[PDB]
Amino acid sequence: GAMGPLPPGWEKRTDSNGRVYFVNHNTRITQWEDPRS
């Protein structure tokens, strides 16, 4: 994670679709963004 992708212990990946996506699985969360706060 770090000051980069998957900040809050997140499963993020950057495929050449070349976009940054975020898969956070608490209940049901799916968005392509750093969740910072």
Swiss-Prot record:
The modification Phosphoserine is found at residue 16. On T-cell activation, phosphorylation by the JNK cascade on serine and threonine residues surrounding the PRR domain accelerates the ubiquitination and degradation of JUN and JUNB. The increased ITCH catalytic activity due to phosphorylation by JNK1 may occur due to a conformational change disrupting the interaction between the PRR/WW motifs domain and the HECT domain and, thus exposing the HECT domain. Phosphorylation by FYN reduces interaction with JUNB and negatively controls JUN ubiquitination and degradation. Monoubiquitinated. Autopolyubiquitinated with 'Lys-63' linkages which does not lead to protein degradation. It comes from the Eukaryota. It is found in: Cell membrane; Cytoplasm; Nucleus; Early endosome membrane. Residues 4-37 form the WW domain. Detected in uterus (at protein level). Widely expressed. The WW domains mediate interaction with PPxY motif-containing proteins. Monomer. Part of a ternary complex composed of SMAD3, ITCH/AIP4 and NEDD9/HEF1; within the complex NEDD9/HEF1 interacts (via N-terminus) with ITCH/AIP4 (via WW domains); the complex mediates ubiquitination and proteasomal degradation of NEDD9/HEF1. Interacts (via WW domains) with OCNL. Interacts (via WW domains) with NOTCH1. Interacts (via WW domains) JUN. Interacts with JUNB; the interaction promotes ITCH-mediated ubiquitination and degradation of JUNB. (Microbial infection) Interacts with Epstein-Barr virus LMP2A. It is linked to Defects in Itch are the cause of the itchy phenotype which is an inflammatory and immunological condition characterized by inflammation in the lung and stomach, hyperplasia in lymphoid and hematopoietic cells and constant itching in the skin. Acts as an E3 ubiquitin-protein ligase which accepts ubiquitin from an E2 ubiquitin-conjugating enzyme in the form of a thioester and then directly transfers the ubiquitin to targeted substrates. It catalyzes 'Lys-29'-, 'Lys-48'- and 'Lys-63'-linked ubiquitin conjugation. Involved in the control of inflammatory signaling pathways. Is an essential component of a ubiquitin-editing protein complex, comprising also TNFAIP3, TAX1BP1 and RNF11, that ensures the transient nature of inflammatory signaling pathways. Promotes the association of the complex after TNF stimulation. This is E3 ubiquitin-protein ligase Itchy. It comes from Mus musculus (Mouse).
